[PDB]
Scaffold this motif. Structure first.
Motif, PDB file in Angstrom:
ATOM      1  N   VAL C   1      42.126  23.335  32.879  1.00 37.63           N
ATOM      2  CA  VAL C   1      42.867  22.966  34.353  1.00 37.63           C
ATOM      3  C   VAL C   1      41.354  23.939  34.489  1.00 37.63           C
ATOM      4  N   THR C   2      42.044  23.188  35.755  1.00 38.80           N
ATOM      5  CA  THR C   2      41.125  24.241  37.503  1.00 38.80           C
ATOM      6  C   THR C   2      42.361  24.602  38.266  1.00 38.80           C
ATOM      7  N   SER C   3      41.974  25.476  38.390  1.00 37.16           N
ATOM      8  CA  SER C   3      42.692  26.372  39.394  1.00 37.16           C
ATOM      9  C   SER C   3      41.724  26.821  40.626  1.00 37.16           C
ATOM     10  N   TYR C   4      42.375  27.803  41.376  1.00 35.59           N
ATOM     11  CA  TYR C   4      41.429  28.422  42.866  1.00 35.59           C
ATOM     12  C   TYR C   4      41.933  29.462  43.286  1.00 35.59           C
ATOM     13  N   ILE C   5      40.078  29.629  43.629  1.00 30.31           N
ATOM     14  CA  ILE C   5      40.190  31.444  44.013  1.00 30.31           C
ATOM     15  C   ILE C   5      40.488  31.692  45.745  1.00 30.31           C
ATOM     16  N   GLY C   6      41.792  32.628  45.363  1.00 32.44           N
ATOM     17  CA  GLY C   6      42.367  32.681  47.051  1.00 32.44           C
ATOM     18  C   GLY C   6      41.533  34.253  47.897  1.00 32.44           C
ATOM     19  N   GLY C   7      42.147  34.926  48.421  1.00 33.09           N
ATOM     20  CA  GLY C   7      41.021  35.683  49.763  1.00 33.09           C
ATOM     21  C   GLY C   7      39.723  35.261  50.073  1.00 33.09           C
ATOM     22  N   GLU C   8      38.940  36.197  50.286  1.00 28.81           N
ATOM     23  CA  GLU C   8      37.760  35.874  50.747  1.00 28.81           C
ATOM     24  C   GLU C   8      36.818  36.921  50.113  1.00 28.81           C
ATOM     25  N   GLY C   9      35.646  36.177  49.206  1.00 34.14           N
ATOM     26  CA  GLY C   9      34.590  37.015  48.264  1.00 34.14           C
ATOM     27  C   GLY C   9      34.602  37.754  46.925  1.00 34.14           C
ATOM     28  N   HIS C  10      34.444  36.739  45.945  1.00 33.27           N
ATOM     29  CA  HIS C  10      35.140  36.627  44.594  1.00 33.27           C
ATOM     30  C   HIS C  10      32.980  36.829  44.184  1.00 33.27           C
ATOM     31  N   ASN C  11      33.728  37.551  42.470  1.00 34.04           N
ATOM     32  CA  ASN C  11      32.817  38.129  41.665  1.00 34.04           C
ATOM     33  C   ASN C  11      32.751  37.006  40.256  1.00 34.04           C
ATOM     34  N   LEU C  12      33.212  35.619  39.996  1.00 33.86           N
ATOM     35  CA  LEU C  12      33.006  34.628  39.329  1.00 33.86           C
ATOM     36  C   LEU C  12      32.376  33.977  39.021  1.00 33.86           C
ATOM     37  N   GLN C  13      31.638  34.037  37.241  1.00 39.34           N
ATOM     38  CA  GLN C  13      30.152  32.785  36.964  1.00 39.34           C
ATOM     39  C   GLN C  13      31.055  32.067  35.640  1.00 39.34           C
ATOM     40  N   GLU C  14      30.043  32.082  34.996  1.00 40.19           N
ATOM     41  CA  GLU C  14      30.721  31.472  33.804  1.00 40.19           C
ATOM     42  C   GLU C  14      30.516  32.377  32.882  1.00 40.19           C
ATOM     43  N   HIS C  15      30.976  32.373  32.367  1.00 41.06           N
ATOM     44  CA  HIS C  15      31.331  33.293  30.537  1.00 41.06           C
ATOM     45  C   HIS C  15      31.595  34.723  31.782  1.00 41.06           C
ATOM     46  N   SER C  16      33.048  34.394  32.568  1.00 46.26           N
ATOM     47  CA  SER C  16      34.047  35.194  33.205  1.00 46.26           C
ATOM     48  C   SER C  16      35.410  34.879  33.082  1.00 46.26           C
ATOM     49  N   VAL C  17      36.125  36.384  32.103  1.00 43.16           N
ATOM     50  CA  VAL C  17      37.414  36.733  31.963  1.00 43.16           C
ATOM     51  C   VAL C  17      38.248  36.675  33.094  1.00 43.16           C
ATOM     52  N   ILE C  18      39.470  35.401  33.125  1.00 44.11           N
ATOM     53  CA  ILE C  18      40.268  35.513  34.369  1.00 44.11           C
ATOM     54  C   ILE C  18      41.515  35.303  34.417  1.00 44.11           C
ATOM     55  N   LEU C  19      42.086  35.533  35.105  1.00 46.80           N
ATOM     56  CA  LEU C  19      44.163  35.338  34.177  1.00 46.80           C
ATOM     57  C   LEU C  19      44.760  34.285  34.789  1.00 46.80           C
ATOM     58  N   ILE C  20      45.026  33.133  34.280  1.00 44.64           N
ATOM     59  CA  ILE C  20      45.714  32.155  35.161  1.00 44.64           C
ATOM     60  C   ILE C  20      46.800  32.110  35.525  1.00 44.64           C
ATOM     61  N   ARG C  21      47.769  31.508  36.480  1.00 44.11           N
ATOM     62  CA  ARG C  21      48.963  31.791  37.441  1.00 44.11           C
ATOM     63  C   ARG C  21      48.955  30.437  37.672  1.00 44.11           C
ATOM     64  N   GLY C  22      50.581  30.345  37.624  1.00 41.30           N
ATOM     65  CA  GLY C  22      51.096  29.321  37.648  1.00 41.30           C
ATOM     66  C   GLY C  22      51.300  29.173  39.282  1.00 41.30           C
ATOM     67  N   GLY C  30      44.381  17.256  41.440  1.00 42.08           N
ATOM     68  CA  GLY C  30      44.115  18.108  40.924  1.00 42.08           C
ATOM     69  C   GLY C  30      44.395  19.443  40.182  1.00 42.08           C
ATOM     70  N   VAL C  31      44.324  21.063  41.492  1.00 42.06           N
ATOM     71  CA  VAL C  31      44.361  21.866  41.179  1.00 42.06           C
ATOM     72  C   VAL C  31      45.478  22.427  41.097  1.00 42.06           C
ATOM     73  N   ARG C  32      46.224  22.758  40.057  1.00 38.88           N
ATOM     74  CA  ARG C  32      47.676  22.961  39.695  1.00 38.88           C
ATOM     75  C   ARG C  32      47.798  25.122  39.829  1.00 38.88           C
ATOM     76  N   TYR C  33      46.741  25.708  39.767  1.00 35.57           N
ATOM     77  CA  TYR C  33      46.731  27.121  39.418  1.00 35.57           C
ATOM     78  C   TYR C  33      46.196  28.209  39.923  1.00 35.57           C
ATOM     79  N   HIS C  34      46.039  29.264  40.048  1.00 38.08           N
ATOM     80  CA  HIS C  34      45.597  30.001  40.561  1.00 38.08           C
ATOM     81  C   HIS C  34      44.973  30.618  40.037  1.00 38.08           C
ATOM     82  N   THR C  35      43.859  31.947  40.248  1.00 36.97           N
ATOM     83  CA  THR C  35      43.337  32.978  39.645  1.00 36.97           C
ATOM     84  C   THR C  35      44.292  34.166  39.933  1.00 36.97           C
ATOM     85  N   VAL C  36      45.119  35.521  39.038  1.00 39.26           N
ATOM     86  CA  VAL C  36      45.654  36.157  39.786  1.00 39.26           C
ATOM     87  C   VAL C  36      44.645  37.496  40.267  1.00 39.26           C
ATOM     88  N   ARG C  37      44.006  38.209  41.054  1.00 42.82           N
ATOM     89  CA  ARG C  37      43.012  39.129  41.563  1.00 42.82           C
ATOM     90  C   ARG C  37      44.358  40.568  40.752  1.00 42.82           C
TER      91      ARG C  37
END
Ligand code: MG
Ligand code: MG
Ligand code: MG
Ligand code: MG
Ligand code: MG
Ligand code: MG
Ligand code: MG
Ligand code: MG
Ligand code: MG
Ligand code: MG
Ligand code: MG
Ligand code: MG
Ligand code: MG
Ligand code: MG
Ligand code: MG
Ligand code: MG
Ligand code: MG
Lengths: 82, 86, 61, 205, 80
Positions: C1-22, C30-37
């Motif tokens: 799926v595709t999620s959205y990154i909140g806040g201002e400034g992040h350190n995400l790139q390819e091969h990064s482990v994230i926690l998708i939240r609903g 198309g965006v249906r999820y976020h990444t819980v910080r």
RNA sequence: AAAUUGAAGAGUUUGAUCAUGGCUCAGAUUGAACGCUGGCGGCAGGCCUAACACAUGCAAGUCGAACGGUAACAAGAAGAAGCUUGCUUCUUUGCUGACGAGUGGCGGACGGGUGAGUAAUGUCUGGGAAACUGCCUGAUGGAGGGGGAUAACUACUGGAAACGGUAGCUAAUACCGCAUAACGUCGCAAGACCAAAGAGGGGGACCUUCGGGCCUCUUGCCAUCGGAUGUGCCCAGAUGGGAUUAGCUAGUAGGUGGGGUAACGGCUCACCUAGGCGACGAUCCCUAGCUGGUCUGAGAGGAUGACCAGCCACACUGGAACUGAGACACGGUCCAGACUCCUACGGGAGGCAGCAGUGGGGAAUAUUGCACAAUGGGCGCAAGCCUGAUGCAGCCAUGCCGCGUGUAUGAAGAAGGCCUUCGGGUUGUAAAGUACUUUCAGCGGGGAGGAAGGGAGUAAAGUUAAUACCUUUGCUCAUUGACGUUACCCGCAGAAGAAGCACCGGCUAACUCCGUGCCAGCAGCCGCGGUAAUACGGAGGGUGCAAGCGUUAAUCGGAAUUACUGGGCGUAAAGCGCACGCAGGCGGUUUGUUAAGUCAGAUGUGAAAUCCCCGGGCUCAACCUGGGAACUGCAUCUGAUACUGG
């Protein structure tokens, strides 16, 4: 066999043994046929600790039921008291 | 195989199985004699076979392996066949 | 799926482990999820002192 | 489990006196209770039905000294008890040990009555109770321990409580500083300015 | 004194057995509607004498072959 | 003296209105996870995912009052050793306490674990006959007399081990005959058949080959009729969706005859009649353990099966059988398939979805803890042994509840910060300072209770030839605790050791400044950011909750937005284009009969647990508990025909 014993239905550090006529093969706090009174080793004065029904206890023990060690002692104490 | 009691009761189970198989084979042979005599003609042979088998089946019934209901069902059916047979 | 990154400034790139939240974004088709910080790799937002629960920001000293 | 901040911002936000001070001085002479606290207290907006219900509930909670969880539990108890829901809620709130101690006058405020209750100073029927929510049954005797009977705070509170109108459902004697709880207070006995319909409607929403 | 049912026989093309169609009245749990429900049973009647069209009366008993656990007690209204 | 205390809307289509109608929100809840924070205590919960495999330790043993025997165990008891006048020894268990190994009974089918399979062979409710049942108990009688093997051992002996073979051995409540019996079995009767086991405590007289007879007691073993419990079977009503799943079934419907289980049963074969199921959903597909219960809702309904309780099914997978009353059996047996591990290559060992713990998966699950002290269970006459059941201990805010993190004050409305119409206001009685308290934590002490029984002794009664021996009744003494640094209380001294989280345009409780400038960004809907948007980030201030605060995951209310309660079809979506007509639904009017539907009463039941009402106990609540009510359901019996139906 069919026996009349005690099942603990209290809480942590608060025992409360109901007198139930349960088969020996069943669990202590699981299946039982009938309930005959209760006992509270923690209840202080002014509270009725024991309410065993002697009539039904005798009616059951006549038909091959076995009275447990502590149950017999409680029955003896109740009979001595009143 | 992990408990000594289990091992010693399996050994006894085998030692009882051999004896029970022997006794049941003897009982089945004695009963089959009655049916063979019944299908073989003369009623006298069937009656003699039944009278010889009877002290075996009842004794086995009163000694474990087989049951009194089984013995009764065998004896009643055999007696009914023999008496009704010419 | 595709999620959205909140806040201002992040350190995400390819091969990064994230926690998708609903949670969906209305203005993003198309965006249906976020990444819980505050998760395994997506660290909290920098220079934020309000609503830190939703962005995984530690209590300032 | 209790409010540890200023005791007069809540009163000035509600708009009236919540009896959170002793009473040696006057509330107006001690604070500025005419507007809400903060930069926009002077500006008065319009409050809706939900706003006025919440204001009434907050006023009651600040007067009595309870939190949202305990207040909702008391509301549920009042609802399950047969009778007027508001009257039952008021009676249940008044039945608290700290509130009856405050009525007897052993504490300047409810925050002091409950402190005395918790500090092994109240001896009810010969048994010490440290719960500020301890319900007081009719014909119950509330007393003070020996180590607190000879305190300056209790005497000052007792002599200050003479200013207020004494409750009609307690029979406290100051000779031994011990009280007996009479028939439970009623809606007429309590203040009539507390709108319990807003309270029963806010939780019904 | 003993429980018994009454129904309508719909098929008897078997040896020493009949097929009955008992009708019952129940109220719908959801809509409260009274509809007729059927409880068909396999009833064995030795010495076959009941045809198709009449009503019969049955009593519960032990199973006989696989699914007929009912016997015929009386024959009421045999008229076609 | 009661189970009665029950219903809230809002935003959004349009220049503006009405109605329809979709979306979102305020609320409650859970086995929860994430972010921040975090003090104590009480009560509960803690692999929802991989029914994915396990290193390691423990979970089912038991009794010598069944037996031979006794190589370890104590006295070497006793005799007696080459006696040191006490260093020890070939002996001694047909002298003792006691049991390494073994035969022999019971338990292993109870206790503990998991929902894979199962949409009915399972589950719940109500009945029924065609049955089995050890330990338990009541009643009636017996309990007479023999035989030959074997485990142990012994000489070997095969094999690396696991195990096994030969010959001599022998004691059993081991095994098998013989004699006896029906209120038992078979048989219409007449008649035929059916088993047994004995052990321990003592003791006068008489004995005795001095082994032990003789007498009581305790207990155990058979046959039969009963009771209780458990189990097995059948029938009736409910038990998800799909018709874009319309035919299924040849042991299948039934019958005749035989054989088989504890019994009824196509349970199965051999013949006969072609039936049986299905539009009231057969068959087929997917998913799913069921129920009491749980959450939401005023109710009706919807979702759901955490803990516990009852039932069901499964023990690496599939198949099978034996012992045993009771299994096709979690730690009993065999084989097949996979995995793991030894092998001397012929060959062998294992199944933690048991209690802890390991590896793997996941957002997420806890110690390789103590005790049988209490309750049971298993064995034993009893002492006595085991129990990872259980009673407890540790961690986790995972859930509920309680307490505290102070307090009366205290105006120069201290100082500082915030904006400021620069006169003032906010923070703010807030803070400093003063008086007061020491809950809770730390220290030093006392300290109930869960513990009831059991053994050693003394008496009376019941026996008995007999105070012996045993049981019962009592009697004082010596005794037994993991929790346990127990609950609880007492004195120490100081306000210390203890508050954070979310929001602030409307829904909705709460507004002012600064920084970018459709950029950063917020977002549940309306929508905001194009020099100030009270809507973004920072600050002040306020709002709400509180050791919790928000988000996420899931259900319901609102949604009357699937409407039985409780909606519509002329135009918002909705009359088939029309007619005929089967099944089905309804049905004019009077009387008679019955009582199916309906109504009233009574009985059985609807387990316990849970909700509600009245009370009690932990300082109080959470929690536990007694009674009542309720379980709105089903069956049966008795009376009514106004109504529907025959
Ligand atoms: Mg966390
Ligand atoms: Mg011999
Ligand atoms: Mg055939
Ligand atoms: Mg609804
Ligand atoms: Mg496994
Ligand atoms: Mg099984
Ligand atoms: Mg485990
Ligand atoms: Mg024990
Ligand atoms: Mg200033
Ligand atoms: Mg807003
Ligand atoms: Mg409509
Ligand atoms: Mg149109
Ligand atoms: Mg239209
Ligand atoms: Mg038309
Ligand atoms: Mg109470
Ligand atoms: Mg119930
Ligand atoms: Mg009529």
């Amino acid at each position: 066999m069919v026996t009349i014993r005690l099942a603990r239905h209290g809480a942590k550090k608060r025992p409360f043994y109901q007198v139930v006529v349960a088969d020996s093969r069943n669990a202590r706090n699981g299946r039982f046929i009938e309930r005959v009174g209760f006992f509270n080793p923690i209840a202080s004065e002014k509270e009725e600790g024991t309410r065993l029904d002697l009539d039904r206890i005798a009616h059951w023990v006549g038909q091959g039921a076995t009275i447990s060690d502590r149950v017999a002692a409680l029955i003896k104490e109740v009979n001595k008291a009143a | 195989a992990n408990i000594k009691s289990a091992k010693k009761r399996a050994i006894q189970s085998e030692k009882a199985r051999k004896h029970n198989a022997s006794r049941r084979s003897m009982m089945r042979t004695f009963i089959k004699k009655v049916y063979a005599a019944i299908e073989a003609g003369d009623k006298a042979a069937a009656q003699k076979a039944f009278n010889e088998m009877q002290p075996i089946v009842d004794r086995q019934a009163a000694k474990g392996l087989i049951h009194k209901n089984k013995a009764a069902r065998h004896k009643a059916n055999l007696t009914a066949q023999i008496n009704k047979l010419a | 799926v595709t999620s959205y990154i909140g806040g201002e400034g992040h350190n995400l790139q390819e091969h990064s482990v994230i926690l998708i939240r609903g949670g969906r974004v209305k203005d993003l088709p198309g965006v249906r999820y976020h990444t819980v910080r505050g998760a395994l790799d997506c660290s909290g937002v920098k220079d934020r002192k309000q609503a830190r629960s939703k962005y995984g920001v530690k209590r300032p000293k | 489990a209790r409010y540890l901040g200023p005791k007069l911002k809540l009163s000035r936000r509600e708009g009236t006196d919540l009896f959170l001070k002793s009473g040696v001085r006057a509330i107006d002479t001690k604070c500025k209770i005419e507007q809400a606290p903060g930069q926009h207290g002077a500006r008065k907006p319009r409050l809706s039905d939900y706003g006025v219900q919440l204001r009434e509930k907050q006023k009651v909670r600040r007067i009595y000294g309870v939190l949202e969880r305990q207040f909702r539990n008391y509301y549920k108890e009042a609802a399950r008890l047969k009778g007027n829901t508001g009257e039952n809620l008021l009676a249940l709130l008044e039945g608290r040990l700290d509130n009856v101690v405050y009525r007897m006058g052993f504490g300047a405020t409810r925050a002091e009555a409950r402190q005395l209750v918790s500090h092994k100073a109240i001896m009810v029927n010969g048994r010490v109770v440290n719960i500020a929510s301890y319900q007081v049954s009719p014909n119950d005797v509330v007393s003070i321990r020996e180590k607190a009977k000879k305190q300056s705070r209790v005497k000052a509170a007792l002599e200050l409580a003479e200013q207020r109108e004494k409750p009609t459902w307690l029979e406290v004697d100051a000779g031994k500083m011990e009280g007996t709880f009479k028939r439970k207070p009623e809606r007429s006995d309590l203040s009539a300015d507390i709108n319990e319909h807003l309270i029963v409607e806010l939780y019904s929403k | 004194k003993i429980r018994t049912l009454q129904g309508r026989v719909v098929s008897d093309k078997m040896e020493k057995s009949i097929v009955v169609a008992i009708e019952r009245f129940v109220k719908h749990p959801i809509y409260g509607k009274f509809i007729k429900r059927t409880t068909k049973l396999h009833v064995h009647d030795e010495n076959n004498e009941c045809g198709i069209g009449d009503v019969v009366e049955i009593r519960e008993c032990r199973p006989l072959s696989k699914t007929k656990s009912w016997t015929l007690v009386r024959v009421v209204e045999k008229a076609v």
